[PDB]
Structure formats: C-alpha cells, structure tokens
C-alpha cells in the first residue's frame, strides 16, 4: 500500500498511461509533444516518440507490443511501429475519418483499431485501408473513454450522455444501453471477467454494473467524496477498485462492499490516469505534475 | 550488470539529454489562444499577422509566436479548454456591424461566451485581449436593434465607447487578469504591436511575479 518505486522523468502535463503486455513496460503520454515508453523495474525509459501535433489526450500500447497509437484533437490518429528495422519510431498511416477530437484510441488487434472520438461516434479502423469497417453511433454527447473486453469482442463507451453504450465490433451494433450516471463519464474500465464493468464520473460516485444485467448492482458513494472520479481500474481478482479522484489523490474501494480499504494520497497534482498491470501486480498513478509513481 | 545494462544506461541518458535540449528549445515560443467566432476576421488577423485545429507560427523581432487556432471543434469546450491552461494570452475577435442579425443577437450571445471564458476557474490569471471588426460599417449604419437601453445618440465614437465598455464591464472575477481592449480598425498596420506590448506587459508582470515583489 506504499510506494515501492517512482519513475517521474517527463516534462509537463502527463495525461494517460497504458500498461504493456509484459507487465513491466508502460507508455506515458504528455501534452509536451513527446511520447515515452517506460520500464517499471529499472526506472529507465526505452523509447521517445516525437509528435507532429503536441495536443494529445490519449495513448495506446498494443497487446502484441509491436505498435503504439497516439492521437489528439487534430482528428488524425497515428499508429507507430516501435520495432522498425531502421530502429526509429515511424507513424504507419495517418487516420483522419472523424470530425471531432480523438478522445481515446485502443488496440483491439494489430489490424483492427478502435478509436472513440468526439464526433459523437466511435469507428473501427484498419491500418491497411484507413477506412471504417464498422462505425458505432448512438451517443448523444462526445465520447471520451472506452474499455475493451479481454476477449476484445464486446466493448462499451461513455460520452456526455450520463450513459454508457456497449458495442459489438463485428456488425457495428450497439449491444447494451447503460444509464444511471448523473454527470459526464470521465473514464470507464472493464472488469476482466468480461461479464461486468464499473464506472465513475464527476458526480462523486462509482457505480457497479453487469453487462448482461444492464442494471446498477450497487453504488460507491461517500459524504467526504464530493470531488469527481477521472480514472477507474480493477484488480485481477476483484475485491478491489482502484479509483483516482478530483481530490488530488487516488482511492481504493472493495468491488463488493466498498469500505475505506486503501488510502492512496501520494500525488500533489490531479491524478490524470490510473492503470493496473495485466497480471495485477502493481498500481500505476499518473498526473500533470510530470511525475510517474507506482505502489504495491 | 554487464554490457547490456551499461549500454541501456547510456541510451537512457542520451534520450534525456536530447529531451532536455528539445524542452529548452520549445520553452522560448510564446503560446497564444485565438477564440475567433464566425466572421470574427480569422482571415483578416492571419493576413495582418503575415479537419482539426490550425497551428500558425510567426516571428516578431527576436521573439517567436505559436498561435493555436481552435476552429470548428464542434465539441463541448470544457473537455479541452484546460489543455490551453499554460497559454499566456487569450485573443478574442468580435464583429461590430452584425448587430442587425438575429439567428438572440450574435453580439449578445458572444458576450456570454466572453462571460463564461472570463469566470472560468482554469483561467484565474490569464491576460485577456479583445479585438474588434467591421467597425466602419457600424458607423455607417448606426442602436435600437441590439442595445436600445443606451438611449443616446447614434454617434459612432460614443456608441463604440458604450459597446467596448459594457463588453469590458462584463468582468466580475478577472481582477487578477487585465482586459486589454483594442479598437481594431481592420486596416491598421501592425495590431500585433498591441499584442507585443501586452505580452511584454504580461512578461514584465511575469518576472515581477517571480522576483517576489508581485
């Protein structure tokens, strides 16, 4: 429950992190205009990606590990090959098919890339063609975050709707309609069962759902919790819910009872991103303080 | 602890050296925010200065400038306005002769955008600079269509004094910031001279904010 190592090593306004598939590497995205692949154990960066557009708000590391996607409000999505023969990081193809801002891009697969953008829709993109195989539409507001299933077949997104909508990636169909949010969904995470998920937002409550139930299971609300939630993540075994807040500190709730299990009060600045390793070994916190620190 | 570890240390230090050099190179550039509405004179300001957002870069004397034209975002402003928190100045452009056009006059709704952007908590202390447009035809036409409560003459000088003051009087919590109103003739030679003096007035305050004395 205490900090084992601290990485830091950036300049300004770290927005997002995504854990690598090795459970050791992580990618750090910042508004500076530089993308960094970190390593947790040796605390030394392994790659630096310059950015044509400095404005980035999301990042993606492929579960293969071969590719890294970064986008922005430019409406242009960039996927970089880390392991080029030349050794430099080069953008595979520009991806400009949206009319808003690319709020979140993730990696369903190497060829099939899911991007949630601020054109009130999400679209499945191929690097080979640069065109939308399936486009997911039905959100009133602008989508900001999405959470893929471990199967990477049924995923959900949240917009300025006070609602979340599942999607089916093959036929481009909305699968479920989740409503029950009071405010705008800042971040959403998926339960690695593939059967449930929980979400938090600015309304200072984290809410537990199940995809097949389409019903709120229980709500995580506290009186001292007036600040909003901007990051949620789980444990590999449940019994836990990592959640960063607008109180400049993360917090931990039980997935079943949500007591004051873990108090995470490290960062001075607003915790922008929070992720759990794919084996669940560590907790990673990121913030605009140019700091990266990981606890255990 | 071998050749692999030593070489990894050298690459992880070389990356940080190049990173530090690039950061020091980037820190000199002045960041400017343009919030030009429809018919604000984006073409006029980009000419007089000479799918996503356009980033123009221009050099005046010994100081560079990077203005980020956020245009046609068509999105909720709050989700991305905090991205420009470190931007030194906010440029506003308003047309004056379109007070006979109701789509709820455009002047009144443009004030609300200024009212919202002034009272935001993110921009506690950011200098606000507003420029004007189409003032000549406003003289040619003019009162009752937009601001009948003025209840005075249709003289352009007093009417411009009324509009610019009440646009500046909308400030309620910007007492840290300074509204730098400039009456853009839309044909004046260098209205970046207003910007350069205003941005150096920020910079003089910026140093005096860091010297301790203010």
């Amino acid at each position, epitope marked *: 429950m205490r900090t084992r190592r601290t990485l830091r090593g950036h300049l300004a306004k770290i927005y997002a992190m995504h854990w690598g598939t090795d459970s050791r590497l992580l990618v750090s995205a910042s508004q500076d205009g530089k993308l960094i692949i970190w390593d947790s154990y040796t605390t030394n960066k392994v790659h630096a990606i310059p950015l044509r557009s400095s404005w980035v708000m999301t990042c993606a590391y492929a579960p293969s590990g071969n590719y890294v996607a970064c986008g922005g409000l430019d409406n242009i999505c960039s996927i970089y090959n880390l392991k080029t023969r030349e050794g430099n990081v080069r953008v595979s193809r520009e991806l400009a098919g949206h009319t808003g801002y690319l709020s979140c891009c993730r990696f369903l697969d190497d060829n099939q890339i899911v991007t949630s953008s601020g054109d009130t829709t999400c679209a499945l993109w191929d690097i080979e063609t640069g065109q939308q195989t399936t486009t997911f539409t039905g959100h009133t507001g602008d989508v900001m975050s999405l959470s893929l299933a471990p199967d990477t077949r049924l995923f959900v997104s949240g917009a300025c709707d006070a609602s979340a909508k599942l999607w089916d990636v093959r036929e481009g169909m909305c699968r479920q309609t989740f409503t029950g949010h009071e405010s705008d969904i800042n971040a959403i995470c998926f339960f690695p069962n593939g059967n449930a998920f929980a979400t938090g937002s600015d309304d200072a409550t984290c809410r537990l759902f199940d995809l097949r139930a389409d019903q709120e299971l229980m709500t995580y609300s506290h009186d001292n919790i007036i600040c909003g939630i901007t990051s949620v993540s789980f444990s590999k075994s449940g019994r836990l819910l990592l959640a960063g807040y607008d109180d400049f500190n993360c917090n931990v709730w039980d997935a079943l009872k949500a007591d004051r299990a873990g108090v995470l009060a490290g960062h001075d600045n607003r915790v922008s991103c929070l992720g759990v390793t794919d084996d669940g070994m560590a907790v990673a916190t990121g913030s605009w303080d140019s700091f990266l620190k990981i606890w255990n | 602890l071998s050749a692999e570890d030593k*070489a990894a240390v050298e690459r992880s230090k070389m990356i940080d050296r190049n990173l530090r050099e690039d950061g020091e190179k980037a820190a000199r550039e002045v960041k400017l925010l343009l919030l030009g509405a429809g018919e604000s004179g984006k073409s006029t300001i980009v000419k007089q200065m000479k799918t996503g957002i356009v980033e123009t870069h221009f050099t005046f004397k010994d100081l560079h400038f990077k203005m980020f034209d956020v245009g046609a975002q068509r999105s909720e402003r709050k989700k991305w306005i905090h991205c420009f928190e470190g931007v030194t100045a906010i440029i506003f452009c308003v047309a004056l002769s379109d007070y006979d056009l109701v789509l709820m006059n455009r002047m009144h709704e443009s004030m609300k955008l200024f009212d919202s952007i002034c009272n935001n908590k993110w921009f506690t202390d950011t200098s606000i600079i507003l420029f004007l447009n189409k003032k000549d035809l406003f003289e040619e036409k003019i009162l009752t269509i937009c601001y009948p409560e003025y209840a005075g003459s249709n003289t352009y000088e007093e009417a411009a004094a009324y509009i610019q003051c009440q646009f500046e009087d909308l400030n309620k919590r910007k007492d840290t910031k300074e509204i730098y109103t400039h009456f853009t003739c839309s044909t004046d030679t260098k209205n970046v001279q207003f910007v350069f003096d205003a941005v150096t007035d920020v910079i003089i305050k910026n140093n005096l904010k860091d010297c301790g004395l203010f």
Partner: single-chain antibody
Amino acid sequence: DVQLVESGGGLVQPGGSRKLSCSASGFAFSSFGMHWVRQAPEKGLEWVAYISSGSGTIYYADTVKGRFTISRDDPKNTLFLQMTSLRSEDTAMYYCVRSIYYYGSSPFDFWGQGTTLTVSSDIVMTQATSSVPVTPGESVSISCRSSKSLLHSNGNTYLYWFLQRPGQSPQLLIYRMSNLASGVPDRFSGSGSGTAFTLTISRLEAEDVGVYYCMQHLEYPLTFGAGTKLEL
C-alpha cells in the same frame, strides 16, 4: 533497410597503422550502439570494441587496450576505428556491428562485409565439437559449454547464438535463451540449463551450413566458442 559497408580493408605494414571504417546509412546510428567483431581468417569470432550511442562508455578487450582507438561521426552517419601496431594476431576479418540495447532489443543483428587486413580472468565458452556431419532433414544438437553460470540475480540470463553462412555475412538466430530473431525460421531453437546450453536444430536443409557460435551478456567478457562447422 540498413547498409553497413567497410572502407578499405587491405594490406598493412607489420606494426603500422591504417584507418578502417564502416560506412553507414539508413538507421538511427545516433540512438544505436555500435560494436566491432573480429574474425581470424581460419577460425574464431570474438569481440573487439564497443562505442555507445552517446559516446560515453568505451570498453576494449585484452589486446585492444590503448593500441586501438575508436571514434564516430553523426552528421555523415558512420563509424571509425583506428588500429595501431598490427601483427599476425592483429590481422583479422573485422566486422562492423550495430547493436541496439534495451529490453527486448536484438543486439548484433546485422554486419558488414569485412576488413581484409593481412600483414607481411576471462569467461571461457567452448562448443563441444567443432565439426558435425549431418543430413538435410534429421535433427541435430550442438552445445556451447561455458565455464561459469550465466544466470543473473534477476532471474533472466543473457546469451546470444549465431549462425555464419558459408563465406558470407552471418546472422543471429536466438537471443537471451528464449527469443527467436526476425527472419529466422522456428526450426532453430536454443535450450539448456542455467550453466549448460545446447541447440535443438530440427529438420535442417541446404542453407544452414556453416560455423555456429555462442555469445553471452551476463559478464562483459565474451570469449565464446571458436565455432562449430555443420557439414553436409
């Protein structure tokens, strides 16, 4: 993709000096680590020198200290190495090497053509037999036998294995005991314990011929096996 061409590998007076350099293009040599590897004209690869990407760490071998020097050039994007006091042992077919270093990187992946230079403790690794007659389609095994264990305290060994084709530029087959290199068929696979190591060649055919090598990275001394011919 990448280009490594050595410049002027020729005759040297005994004990003299001569500038040798591998001209380079098409890769981030600024961010890349470089090596030079010698080949005696009959038998034996071993490491010579290493220059870092940031030119901060310089390491030489036992007969490379002082009398050999190294240097680089980033805008022209090439590498130099100056050799003085050249004798019969100093004569070798030196190979210009690039080698990127991080987690999962594949160092010693590409080579040049060579420097044809003719005039006029240490960890010990040896491959078990240097000549094995084979048949194109039956599985064989070859073992590089070290002297001390290769397993680091962090639990992951560092040990790289190589294939030299008959008279041309070599390749890397498997790096750090578990990871196959790009452009290499899966039929080649290394194995062994933390101290003993052996190759599992499966269903070989008529391009695997040539000398085979080990190399480690737990200690800076390499001194790997002198080679193993795999003759038809």
